[PDB]
Structures are given as structure tokens and as C-alpha cells.
Design an enzyme around this catalytic site. Sequence first.
Site, short mmCIF file in Angstrom:
data_model
loop_
_atom_site.label_atom_id
_atom_site.label_comp_id
_atom_site.label_asym_id
_atom_site.label_seq_id
_atom_site.Cartn_x
_atom_site.Cartn_y
_atom_site.Cartn_z
CB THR A 264 32.21 35.67 -30.56
OG1 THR A 264 31.91 36.04 -29.20
CG2 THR A 264 33.50 36.35 -31.02
CG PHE A 389 34.93 29.36 -25.27
CD1 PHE A 389 34.16 30.48 -25.45
CD2 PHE A 389 34.39 28.14 -25.59
CE1 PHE A 389 32.84 30.39 -25.93
CE2 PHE A 389 33.10 28.01 -26.07
CZ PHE A 389 32.29 29.15 -26.22
CB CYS A 396 35.75 32.90 -23.11
SG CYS A 396 34.30 33.91 -23.48
C1 HEM Z 1 30.79 31.84 -28.84
C2 HEM Z 1 31.09 32.91 -28.16
C3 HEM Z 1 32.40 33.35 -27.73
C4 HEM Z 1 33.63 33.01 -28.13
C5 HEM Z 1 33.94 32.14 -29.33
C6 HEM Z 1 34.57 33.77 -27.30
C7 HEM Z 1 35.98 33.61 -27.39
C8 HEM Z 1 36.91 34.13 -26.50
C9 HEM Z 1 38.33 33.97 -26.61
C10 HEM Z 1 39.03 33.15 -27.66
C11 HEM Z 1 38.92 34.64 -25.59
C12 HEM Z 1 40.40 34.75 -25.30
C13 HEM Z 1 40.92 36.00 -25.96
C14 HEM Z 1 42.43 36.10 -25.94
O1 HEM Z 1 43.14 35.15 -25.59
O2 HEM Z 1 42.95 37.20 -26.36
C15 HEM Z 1 37.85 35.23 -24.82
C16 HEM Z 1 38.06 36.10 -23.79
C17 HEM Z 1 36.98 36.80 -23.25
N1 HEM Z 1 35.68 36.68 -23.57
FE1 HEM Z 1 34.81 35.59 -24.90
N2 HEM Z 1 33.88 34.44 -26.37
C18 HEM Z 1 32.57 34.23 -26.53
C19 HEM Z 1 31.52 34.81 -25.84
C20 HEM Z 1 31.72 35.76 -24.82
C21 HEM Z 1 30.74 36.32 -24.03
C22 HEM Z 1 29.29 36.03 -24.15
C23 HEM Z 1 31.33 37.20 -23.17
C24 HEM Z 1 30.70 38.02 -22.16
C25 HEM Z 1 29.49 37.93 -21.63
C26 HEM Z 1 32.72 37.16 -23.39
C27 HEM Z 1 33.69 37.90 -22.73
C28 HEM Z 1 35.06 37.62 -22.84
C29 HEM Z 1 35.97 38.30 -21.95
C30 HEM Z 1 35.66 39.38 -20.95
C31 HEM Z 1 37.18 37.84 -22.24
C32 HEM Z 1 38.46 38.24 -21.57
C33 HEM Z 1 38.76 37.30 -20.43
C34 HEM Z 1 39.99 37.66 -19.63
O3 HEM Z 1 41.14 37.57 -20.18
O4 HEM Z 1 39.88 38.05 -18.42
N3 HEM Z 1 32.94 36.28 -24.43
N4 HEM Z 1 36.61 34.94 -25.41
O1 LIG Z 2 38.36 38.42 -28.54
C1 LIG Z 2 37.55 39.47 -29.04
C2 LIG Z 2 36.74 39.01 -30.21
N1 LIG Z 2 36.00 40.16 -30.81
C3 LIG Z 2 36.39 41.05 -31.78
N2 LIG Z 2 35.36 41.92 -32.03
C4 LIG Z 2 34.29 41.56 -31.21
N3 LIG Z 2 34.69 40.48 -30.43
C5 LIG Z 2 36.58 39.90 -27.95
N4 LIG Z 2 35.84 38.73 -27.39
C6 LIG Z 2 36.12 37.85 -26.44
N5 LIG Z 2 35.06 37.06 -26.27
C7 LIG Z 2 34.17 37.54 -27.16
N6 LIG Z 2 34.63 38.54 -27.92
C8 LIG Z 2 38.48 40.54 -29.55
C9 LIG Z 2 39.67 40.24 -30.26
C10 LIG Z 2 40.49 41.27 -30.75
C11 LIG Z 2 40.14 42.61 -30.52
F1 LIG Z 2 40.87 43.67 -30.93
C12 LIG Z 2 38.99 42.94 -29.85
C13 LIG Z 2 38.14 41.95 -29.35
F2 LIG Z 2 37.04 42.40 -28.72
#
Ligand code: HEM
Ligand SMILES: OC(Cn1cncn1)(Cn1cncn1)c1ccc(F)cc1F
EC number: 1.14.14.1
Length: 453
Positions: A264, A389, A396
Amino acid sequence: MPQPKTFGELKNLPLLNTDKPVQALMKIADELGEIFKFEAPGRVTRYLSSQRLIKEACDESRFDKNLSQALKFVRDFFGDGLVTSWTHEKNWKKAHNILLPSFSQQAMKGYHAMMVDIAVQLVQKWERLNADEHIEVPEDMTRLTLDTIGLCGFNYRFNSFYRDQPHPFITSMVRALDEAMNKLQRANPDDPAYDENKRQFQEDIKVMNDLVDKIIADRKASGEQSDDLLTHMLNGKDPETGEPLDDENIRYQIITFLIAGHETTSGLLSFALYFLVKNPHVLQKAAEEAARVLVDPVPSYKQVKQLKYVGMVLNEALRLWPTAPAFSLYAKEDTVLGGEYPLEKGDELMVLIPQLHRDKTIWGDDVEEFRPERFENPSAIPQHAFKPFGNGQRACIGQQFALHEATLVLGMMLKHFDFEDHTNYELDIKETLTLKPEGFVVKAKSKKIPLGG
Ligand code: HEM
Ligand SMILES: OC(Cn1cncn1)(Cn1cncn1)c1ccc(F)cc1F
């Protein structure tokens, strides 16, 4: 409640048999408005597109995170990692508590130097191109973001800038995630000639897990103290329970973080550079800020924090094309949404982020314009209007990591080069489970400014 075209017992599902399903859903939202029902055999989802409905859906007393079909499918290799576990599965909260410290300011300050290491590799690559060569933008941003999470999180070098094609982890990851996106597989997953896809899928999973093995072996063989994400994974104890993560969970977190941690963010950098080359006055202003602020041969942490306009460019890119474009909630009890739409316990909602971010009641009639100045004043943006996010305790965990890396890199790019949209590129958005511009290419002319070690 509005509903798009159905096809007999397949209900709405054929609408998503397309290369670009999120874009199709946005068009359906354009036609039907703030909420529509979407049915597939075996399940019903309601897609929300307005801030007034999404604001209610983001109330955690009424709605919790749902694992959507895609999240359930990928759990075959993400397991009960943070992205793919239910809020009430013990290992969600336990991992959340153990890992959260790895994303504090202090931790970010600790990652900065290694973010710079990968950023310098990107800038060097582009300095070294010959006349009239061009840059493949999403390709290079993926190289950078993968290496960044590898090194910052795991002290592991993917060495993406030493390859002319993707790291094998990426090649398997993309096929494994595409397999999952092939969710409508004759709605007969047990068919004849899927034994092929099923085999390939296990092989792809095995390539990813063999890389995880190397990360863990290399850590164990190391004579130096890393104090990074992996350290906390291996050693951290949940203060609510006294327990550390078990071995199986650790492996799922490594896979989770390597994937979520780069894809992402690559998409975001690519969209940001796209919008910059299409809006030359915005580019000029960002580039003026980079030049004024980034006065040393490499950026410091405090300097990246001062790239305010660059931050706004990123936020405006995330507004128009949020690279994880949807998240799913379920109703915790029977309830009524927006005074008008009754829901039963367990009913699923899907937040369609790009539509939320085009809500004219919030953003006005310039919604399609790229105007980073919209973000000048945070308090002029209503709660739950901008949600690239996700939401609440399931938002996130990596947000500040993504934004620090993207700000650093875009700042360095803008300092060191002038960019040309030499092909007058037409935006084509490829969808995997995320969004990225496909085939986006530019030329970069070096401003010949020295880098430091
Ligand atoms: C522009 C960059 C990114 C966007 C747009 C993004 C977006 C999101 C979104 C929308 C969710 C919620 C998912 C849901 O509700 O099912 C999420 C969860 C998460 N993101 Fe990202 N993310 C970004 C970058 C990252 C990065 C850099 C990391 C790790 C270093 C990361 C790790 C995660 C993790 C582990 C979750 C799960 C959180 C939890 O429910 O405990 N993401 N992210
Ligand atoms: O939300 C993510 C977006 N994603 C899908 N492919 C790679 N990233 C994981 N994410 C959260 N923060 C950044 N990435 C996700 C959504 C649906 C899914 F099946 C997997 C999955 F990783």
C-alpha cells in the site's frame, strides 16, 4: 435499499468478475448512492459511501471489524496475524499489545537511518540511468518499500535494487494474493483443473515461508543487537497476560508485516508522483519545500517532519486513491443505521473508501481536483470523513511508518531530480487486493546535488 443487477442464483457476483472490481463498485455507488446491497451465493454485504453513514459505522460500541471473504481466504498464509484475526481472538489483543511499542516515535526515530539507506539506493539508481532511459515508477517504489520493511523491521536485506525483476517473495506473494482474489472460482473450488492452482498456491506459500525461515535463522546467527520489530515479536510479553507470542503466531506476523508493510505504501508513492507530474504548480511548490528543508546531504528525522506540504501531497493522494480501498465491519447487535436501514446482528458492512473521499457534502464540488491545500487545516475535516488507514482499535498500526517513509522518499526525489511525464501517461489503475498505477513511467533529470553516506 438500492441493488445492482443480479444474475439468477449467482446474484451480484459476476459484477466482480472483472480486472477492476473496486472501480466497478465505485461506478455502482455513483449510480445508486450512499448505500447498496450486494449479494453473492452464501453472503450479503452492504456497501457504504457517505460520511454520514460511515461515521455511524465507525462507532465501535455498535460495529466491530469483520473479516471479509478476502481476509478469510488469505488467512491461509497470514494466519492469526494482526490483519486477519478477529478482535476477540486472544492473539489479536496479545499481539497488538506486544507490537504497538514498535510504532512509537521513539521506534520511528530508530528506523529512520535504515529508511535513509534504502532511499539513497533509489536515488543512486536514478542518478545512474543513461540518457533517454526512463523510470518504471510502481516497480521502483515496490523495490524501495519492500526493502524498507525488510531492513527496518527484520534487519534483512531483500536487495531489490540488485534485481531487474521482482524478488521471488514478491512473485509468489502476488500469485498467492491473486489466487485468493479468484474467489468466484466456478463457485466450485473443488473442480477438476484447480488441482493446478491449489498446488501452485502451496508452492507460493512455501516460497514465502522459506524466506521467513531465513529471516529467523539470520536473526539467530546474528552477533549484533538489532532492537527492531522482530526483536519485539520474539521477546515481547503481553502485560495483560505475561505471555510472549508463540512460534506459529510469530511466523504469521512476519508474513503479515512483510506484505502489509510495503504494498500500500508503494501504491501511495506511485499515485503521489502521478498527481505531481499532472499538476505542475503543485510539483513546484513541493519541490521548493524539499529544497528549502532538506539542506543536508541526507535527511534527518526532524527534517522529514518539517516537510508539511509533502505530507499534504500524500494525504491528498490517499484521498483520491486510498491504496487499501475497503474495510469491513459487522453489526454487534440488531440496530438501525442512519435512522433508516435496519440491520441484524452479524450483518456485514463494507466501507468504500474512495467514495467516502468523494462525498461532495464534505469536500465540495472540487472533489476530483488534486488540491493538497485542502489539508491545510485538520480541524476543517470532520471526524470519519478521511479514513485511508481504517478505524479505531483496528486502524493501521503502521500508519506513521508508511507516512514517514513516503515523506522522506518523496522529499529526496523532489530535491534531487526534475521529472517529466514524457509519455503523457494515461492513468490505468491495476487492482490486486490494493490499488496501483500500472505502466506509469517518467523521466528524471538529475539536479546533480551530492548525496552523503
Ligand atoms: C499508505 C499505507 C497504508 C495504508 C493505506 C494502510 C491501510 C490500512 C487499513 C485500511 C487497515 C485496516 C484494515 C481493516 O480494517 O481490515 C490497516 C491495518 C493494518 N495495517 Fe496498514 N496501511 C498502510 C501501511 C502499513 C504499514 C507500513 C504497515 C506495517 C509496517 C501496516 C500494517 C497494518 C497492520 C498490521 C494492520 C492491522 C492492524 C490491526 O488490526 O491490528 N500498514 N492498514
Ligand atoms: O489491508 C491489507 C491491504 N493489502 C492487500 N494486499 C497487500 N496489502 C493489508 N494491509 C494493511 N495495511 C497495509 N496493508 C489487506 C486487505 C485484504 C487482504 F486479504 C489482505 C491484506 F493484506
